[PDB]
């Protein structure tokens, strides 16, 4: 805003027109402070991503500095809001925020990932100039991965009448849904109503359930409560029951959403209108056969995902986040674990609308700091909250851990995508001292979660289960006794079996799996020189497993509910095997600064293993993908100059061919068929059982041929169980690879060629480097320069390469393995964006993006 007045929506965007300064000496909380030389910024904003890399920082957190940042916004509150209540909401600030309003200190908030709020009412100047100030102190080292710094999530203002529904004030339960499904469904609601006026109110609620977007004419249930007197200055929980007439279920394939609207009446008139989003669905976890959704067995085909958005840094841009989910859905992913901290609300929103199941994790460490990170949340978890700290969002009577956990649950309690609360990750890993206190701390978190929300199972991800620690056994039983689910980090097949034998009562899953480490487009070796790693699936960390192995072990076992592979997307920091937990660079500078863990790189460009997962997980598409790229200077030659050719596919049978350079005739190289296996619960998977099968069982989840090198084309044909061809139009992946010429042309394409002109929406522009005939040159690293004209601007450039230290805010970047990305953002005026990609000696490429005015 620049001015706040009636009638903005009850909750309105407050992202625009802030001023920013990086200084650990300035004191700028006074409204009369001169900030004329400060940067003007729109939020969300990350001030680590704009600073330089430095060897004096830590590899763990991408060698980037944190620091003390100040944010100021001056805005008018019109006289017409005089008797209204005003609050400011932060979906996240990393970290150690301090908030002032018109010179008065309101309070503080340590945790960089939980949402919080401040009432502004008591200090507001109605009919005047106002100044809100936020001091942020990301004092390093505070993180095991790249955190970023600043107000990296959206900010809103909430304006209401004196009588109003409390912050996150509606809870909905449907405890008999499974039985009532298709008929009248009982909704039990509880609504906190606050009377912040100087007279008693006679309150009735009018609550309505209707399809999202969506008018009240199409409601499927309503209720009006009996009159309840709420005294001046008091609040009350108001229980109500809605009978919902045959609601449509929220499922992965059809994620139906409803709006649940609460109108607060006092006397005869409506004073407040509160909406919350809801979906009808139920889940189950069973010790013997795993997970179910709405009464149907479902395998949790999941990824772990850190919060950052690549070249954008920590900024929680809704489209950036929506794009990640889309790319993951294409892989066959149906679930995300928010490692290791609450997600942005934007992710929750996207998963509600797209039909993705979320395991929302709240904490990494508990009351013991990890990896030498003396300023991490470990230092805060068990501290108390000062009585004059006015911060709002959760329970304030015990510790920060209770506040941040209940604050997170309060925000997302009605979101259908969220299926479990995860309370910790590897709590006893990388810390110092006794772990004798960890069972009691766990039981305490479990009790708080149960009392906050009875509708979902709680969990955690624990890596000492495989080591059989007593503390872990005790903690596991405690989860179970409270209807929770036990997540084991990095167990193999044999350990899954041991847990199941040793603990028959536990419902279990793979809460962190694989940790395969690969670069994109790397073929001149097949096993784990140039600060890159093979793209073949034969490279994992010592405690981890390659992708085929971690899946093979899960797919055979109905009692292992699912897997959350580490990770879906590469993220900034933890550049294992070049990681470092203290100060200083690893290997020669520039050192790898982002992860190798991801199936998809930071730019959103899939690595080869993407198509293995797709062949395993996506039953809505077929897959046929060949590696390696077929250029002499990128392949690996084994015995007899034979190259390992790998095919990932969900087909029943594959024929492999070769075409010589300059020929139009292909000859047959090989032919292989899979075997269908079926588990007791009815899950099916495919394995190769021919007599030339690999000696390692899991590698038979895919196909390998040893092919002599020669210039030309390797191509594949796919057949179903009835020996009918599976045509190219129905199949994803590279069904052929060919020897390319030298780089000659750029080829750009935008993912969405029409976007919203709201100063927020993004268009992602992939640029390929190709030869004269359009084949992507596999090792091309040509420097590409973007020229953006019209109603938008370049906000990022990326190539996903870990050792690339070039600025993400530059207008140019080297391609890596033939690809480079540019990200363009709209303005607040409708128009058109023209983007030209250029490289020396190559043909240029132009895309055209239209931007449309907000309805």
Does position 854 interact with a second copy (CB under 8 A)? The reply is no
Write each residue from 572 to 591 as x if it is in contact with Ni ion (CB under 5 A), else as -, in one continuous string: ---------x----------
Does position 567 interact with Ni ion (CB under 5 A)? The reply is no
Does position 430 interact with Ni ion (CB under 5 A)? The reply is no
Min separation Cβ 431 and Ni ion, Å: 12
Taking the C-alpha atoms of residue 234 and residue 572, their distance in angstroms, rounded to an integer, is: 47
**Dihedral sign, Cα of residue 358, residue 362, residue 365, residue 366:** negative
Taking the C-alpha atoms of residue 855 and residue 848, their distance in angstroms, rounded to an integer, is: 22
Taking the C-alpha atoms of residue 731 and residue 30, their distance in angstroms, rounded to an integer, is: 62
Q: Which range, of 74-82, 494-502, 674-682, 839-847, touches a second copy by CB under 8 A?
A: 839-847
Applying CB under 8 A, which of residues 640, 662, 841, 855 lies at the interface with a second copy? 841
- Residue 650 interacts with, from Na ion, Mg ion, a second copy, none (CB under 5-8 Å by kind): Mg ion
- Residue 372 interacts with, from a second copy, Na ion, Ni ion, none (CB under 5-8 Å by kind): Ni ion
Min separation Cβ 832 and a second copy, Å: 8
On whether the CB atoms of residues 797 and 783 are closer than 8 A, the answer is no
Q: Which range, of 72-80, 270-278, 321-329, 842-850, touches a second copy by CB under 8 A?
A: 842-850
Q: Which range, of 75-83, 216-224, 314-322, 694-702, touches Mg ion by CB under 5 A?
A: 314-322
- Measured N-to-C along each axis, helices 547-555 and 493-502 cross at an angle, to the nearest 10 degrees, of 30
- Residue 40 interacts with, from a second copy, Mg ion, Ni ion, none (CB under 5-8 Å by kind): a second copy
Does position 812 interact with a second copy (CB under 8 A)? The reply is yes
Distances (CA, A) of 806 to 50, 61, 783, 813: 11, 17, 11, 7
Binding region for Na ion (CB under 5 A): 516, 518, 537, 547, 609
Q: Residue 38 or 596: which CB sits closer to a second copy?
A: 38
Does residue 555 have a known ligand-binding role? no
Does position 373 interact with Mg ion (CB under 5 A)? The reply is yes
- Residue 639 interacts with, from Ni ion, a second copy, Mg ion, none (CB under 5-8 Å by kind): none
Backbone angles phi, psi at 840, to 5 degrees: -60, 125
Q: Which of 410, 409, 399, 481 is nearest to 443 (CA)?
A: 481
Does residue 738 have a known ligand-binding role? no
Does position 310 interact with Mg ion (CB under 5 A)? The reply is yes
Min separation Cβ 40 and a second copy, Å: 4
Q: Which of 230, 232, 231 is nearest to 204 (CA)?
A: 230
On whether the CB atoms of residues 815 and 769 are closer than 8 A, the answer is yes
Applying CB under 5 A, which of residues 240, 317, 371, 410 lies at the interface with Ni ion? 371
Write each residue from 747 to 766 as x if it is in contact with a second copy (CB under 8 A), else as -, in one continuous string: ------xx------------
Q: Which range, of 198-206, 328-336, 456-464, 802-810, touches a second copy by CB under 8 A?
A: 802-810
Q: Residue 373 or 408: which CB sits closer to Ni ion?
A: 373
Does position 744 interact with a second copy (CB under 8 A)? The reply is yes
- Residue 36 interacts with, from Mg ion, a second copy, Na ion, none (CB under 5-8 Å by kind): a second copy
Q: Residue 446 or 743: which CB sits closer to a second copy?
A: 743
On whether the CB atoms of residues 749 and 766 are closer than 8 A, the answer is yes
Min separation Cβ 848 and a second copy, Å: 6
Write each residue from 36 to 75 as x if it is in contact with a second copy (CB under 8 A), else as -, in one continuous string: xxxxx-----------x-----------------------
Please enumerate in sequence order all residues whose Cβ is within 8 A of that of 98, keeping only pairs 6 or more positions apart, or say none. Answer: 105, 107, 108, 134, 135, 136, 137
Applying CB under 8 A, which of residues 783, 793, 853, 854 lies at the interface with a second copy? 783
Transcribe 220-272 into DSSP letters: SEEEEPPPEEE-TT-EEEEEEEEEEESPPBB-SSSB--EEEEEEEEETTEEEE
Site size for Ni ion, by CB under 5 A? 6
Taking the C-alpha atoms of residue 652 and residue 719, their distance in angstroms, rounded to an integer, is: 6
Applying CB under 5 A, which of residues 92, 141, 255, 313 lies at the interface with Mg ion? 141
Helix (H, G, I), strand (E, B) or coil at 172: strand
Binders of Ni ion among 31-60, rule CB under 5 A?
60
Backbone angles phi, psi at 405, to 5 degrees: -65, -50
Q: Residue 248 or 745: which CB sits closer to a second copy?
A: 745
- Measured N-to-C along each axis, helices 345-354 and 400-412 cross at an angle, to the nearest 10 degrees, of 30
Q: Which one-letter DSSP state was computed for residue 701?
A: G
Q: Residue 440 or 810: which CB sits closer to a second copy?
A: 810
- Residue 785 interacts with, from Ni ion, a second copy, Na ion, none (CB under 5-8 Å by kind): a second copy
- Residues carrying an active site annotation: 426, 512
Q: Residue 60 or 462: which CB sits closer to Ni ion?
A: 60
Say which residue the tokens 């899950």 belong to: 683
Taking the C-alpha atoms of residue 197 and residue 164, their distance in angstroms, rounded to an integer, is: 10
Applying CB under 5 A, which of residues 372, 382, 790, 831 lies at the interface with Ni ion? 372
Q: Residue 130 or 614: which CB sits closer to Mg ion?
A: 614
Applying CB under 5 A, which of residues 43, 260, 320, 517 lies at the interface with Mg ion? 320
Does residue 767 have a known ligand-binding role? no
Q: Which range, of 22-30, 179-187, 292-300, 615-623, touches Mg ion by CB under 5 A?
A: 615-623
Does position 793 interact with a second copy (CB under 8 A)? The reply is no
Does position 273 interact with a second copy (CB under 8 A)? The reply is no
Please enumerate in sequence order all residues whose Cβ is within 8 A of that of 819, keeping only pairs 6 or more positions apart, or say none. Answer: 520, 521, 603, 605, 766, 767, 768, 769, 776, 799
Helix (H, G, I), strand (E, B) or coil at 744: coil
Q: Which of 700, 736, 703, 698 is nearest to 717 (CA)?
A: 736
- Residue 628 interacts with, from Na ion, Mg ion, Ni ion, none (CB under 5-8 Å by kind): none
Query: In this structure, what token pair is assigned to residue 790?
Result: 């019209």
Q: According to the 3-state scheme, what is the secondary structure of 179-217?
A: HHCCCEEEEEEEEEEEECCCCCEEEEEEEEEEECCCCHH
Min separation Cβ 199 and a second copy, Å: 43
Taking the C-alpha atoms of residue 475 and residue 485, their distance in angstroms, rounded to an integer, is: 11
Please enumerate in sequence order all residues whose Cβ is within 8 A of that of 786, keeping only pairs 6 or more positions apart, or say none. Answer: 765, 794, 797, 811, 812, 822, 835, 836, 837, 838
In 3-state terms the chain splits into helix, strand, coil percentages (rounded to 5) of: 15, 40, 45
- Bridge partners for 77 per DSSP: 4, 128
200-237 CB burial, b ≥16 within 10 A, e <16: ebebbbbbbbbeeeeeeeebbbeeebeeeebeeeebbe
Does position 371 interact with Mg ion (CB under 5 A)? The reply is yes
**Residue 80 CA to chain centroid, in angstroms?**
40
Q: Which range, of 504-512, 630-638, 731-739, 840-848, touches a second copy by CB under 8 A?
A: 840-848
Taking the C-alpha atoms of residue 502 and residue 505, their distance in angstroms, rounded to an integer, is: 9
Does position 317 interact with a second copy (CB under 8 A)? The reply is no
Applying CB under 5 A, which of residues 141, 461, 792, 818 lies at the interface with Ni ion? 141
Q: According to the 3-state scheme, what is the secondary structure of 237-248?
A: EEEEEEEEECCC
Q: Residue 110 or 141: which CB sits closer to Ni ion?
A: 141
Chain contacts with Ni ion (rule: CB under 5 A):
60, 141, 371-373, 581
Chain contacts with a second copy (rule: CB under 8 A):
36-40, 52, 741-745, 753-754, 772-773, 783, 785, 806-807, 810, 812, 832, 836, 840-841, 843, 846, 848, 850, 852
Chain contacts with Mg ion (rule: CB under 5 A):
141, 309-310, 320, 371-373, 581, 618, 650
Residues within the annotated binding site? 58, 60, 371, 373, 581, 618, 621, 650
Residues within the annotated binding site for Mg(2+)? 58, 60, 371, 373, 581, 618, 621, 650
């Amino acid at each position: 805003s620049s001015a706040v007045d009636s009638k903005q929506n009850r909750t309105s965007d407050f992202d625009a027109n802030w001023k920013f300064m990086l200084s650990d000496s300035v004191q700028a909380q006074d409204p009369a402070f001169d900030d004329s030389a400060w940067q003007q910024v729109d939020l969300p904003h990350d001030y680590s991503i704009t600073q330089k890399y430095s060897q004096s920082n830590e590899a763990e957190s991408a060698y980037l500095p944190g620091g003390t940042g100040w944010y100021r916004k001056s805005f008018t509150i019109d006289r017409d809001l005089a008797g209204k209540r005003i609050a400011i909401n932060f979906d996240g600030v990393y970290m150690n925020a301090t908030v002032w309003f018109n010179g008065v200190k309101l309070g503080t908030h340590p945790y960089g990932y939980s949402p919080f709020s401040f009432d502004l009412t008591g200090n507001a100047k109605f009919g005047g100039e106002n100044t809100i100030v936020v001091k942020v102190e990301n004092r390093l080292p505070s993180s095991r991965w790249y955190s970023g710094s600043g107000i990296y999530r959206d900010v809103t203002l909430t304006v209401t009448d004196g009588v109003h529904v409390g912050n996150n004030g509606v809870a909905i339960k449907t405890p008999s849904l499974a039985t009532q499904n298709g008929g009248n469904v009982t909704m039990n609601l509880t609504t906190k109503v606050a009377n912040d006026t100087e007279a008693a109110a006679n309150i009735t609620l009018k609550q309505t359930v209707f399809p999202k977007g969506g008018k009240t004419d199409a409601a499927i249930g309503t209720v009006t409560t009996a009159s309840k007197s709420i005294a001046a200055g008091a609040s009350a929980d108001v229980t109500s029951t809605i009978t919902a007439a045959s609601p449509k279920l929220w499922s992965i394939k059809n994620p139906n959403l409803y709006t649940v609207r609460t109108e607060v009446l006092n006397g005869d008139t409506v004073l407040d209108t509160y909406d919350t989003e809801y979906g009808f669905r139920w889940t189950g976890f069973d010790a013997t056969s795993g997970f179910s959704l709405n009464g149907e067995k479902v395998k949790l085909k999941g990824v772990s995902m850190h919060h950052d958005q690549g070249s954008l840094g920590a900024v929680a841009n809704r489209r950036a986040i929506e794009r990640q989910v889309e790319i993951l859905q294409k892989m066959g992913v149906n679930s995300i674990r928010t490692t290791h901290n609450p997600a942005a609300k934007a992710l929750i929103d996207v998963c509600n609308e797209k039909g993705v199941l979320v395991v929302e994790e709240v904490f990494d460490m508990w009351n013991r700091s990890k990896n030498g990170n003396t300023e991490d949340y470990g230092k805060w978890f068990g501290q108390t909250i000062a009585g004059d700290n006015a911060v709002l969002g959760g329970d304030k009577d015990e510790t920060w851990a209770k506040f941040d956990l209940t604050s997170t649950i309060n925000r997302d309690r009605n979101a259908p995508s969220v299926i479990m609360w995860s309370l910790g990750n590897e709590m006893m890993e990388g810390i110092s001292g006794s772990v004798s206190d960890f069972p009691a701390t766990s039981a305490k978190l479990v009790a708080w979660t149960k009392a906050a929300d009875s509708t979902r199972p709680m969990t955690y991800g624990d890596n000492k289960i495989k080591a059989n620690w007593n503390e872990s056994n005790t903690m596991g039983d405690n989860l179970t006794a409270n209807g929770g689910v036990v997540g084991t980090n990095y167990s193999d097949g044999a350990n899954y079996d041991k847990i199941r034998t040793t603990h028959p009562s536990w419902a279990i899953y793979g809460s962190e799996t694989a940790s395969a480490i690969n670069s994109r487009g790397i073929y001149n070796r097949t096993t784990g020189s140039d600060k890159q790693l093979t793209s073949y699936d034969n490279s994992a960390v010592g405690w981890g497993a390659v992708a085929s192995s971690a899946w093979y072990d899960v797919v055979q076992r109905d009692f292992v509910a699912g897997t959350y592979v580490w990770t879906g997307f590469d993220y900034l920091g933890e550049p294992t095997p070049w990681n470092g937990t203290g100060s200083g660079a690893v290997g020669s500078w520039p050192s790898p600064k982002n992860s190798y863990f991801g199936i998809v790189d930071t730019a959103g460009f899939p690595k080869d293993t993407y198509y293995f997962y797709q062949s395993q997980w996506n039953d809505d598409v077929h897959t046929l993908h060949i590696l390696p790229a077929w250029n002499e200077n990128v392949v690996a030659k084994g015995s007899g100059n034979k190259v390992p050719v790998v095919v990932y596919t969900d087909a029943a049978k594959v024929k492999l061919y070769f075409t010589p350079k300059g020929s139009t005739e292909k000859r047959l190289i090989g032919e292989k068929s899979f075997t269908k296996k079926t588990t007791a619960a009815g899950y099916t998977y495919q394995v190769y059982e021919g007599t030339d099968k690999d000696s390692t069982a899991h590698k038979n989840m895919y196909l390998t041929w040893n092919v002599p090198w020669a210039e030309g084309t390797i191509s594949a044909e796919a057949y179903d169980e009835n020996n009918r061809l599976i045509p190219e139009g129905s199949t994803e992946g590279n069904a052929s690879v060919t020897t390319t010429g030298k780089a000659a042309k750029l080829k750009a394409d935008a993912d969405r060629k029409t976007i919203t002109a709201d100063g927020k929406d993004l268009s992602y522009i992939e640029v390929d480097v190709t030869d004269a005939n359009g084949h992507i040159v596999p090792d091309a690293a040509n420097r590409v320069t973007f020229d953006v004209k019209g109603a938008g601007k370049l906000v990022g450039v990326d190539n996903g390469s870990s050792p690339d230290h070039d600025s993400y805010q530059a207008d140019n970047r080297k391609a890596f393995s033939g690809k480079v990305l540019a990200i363009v953002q709209s303005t607040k005026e409708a128009g058109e964006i023209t983007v030209t990609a250029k490289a020396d000696g190559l043909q240029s490429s132009t895309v055209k993006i239209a931007t449309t005015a907000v309805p």
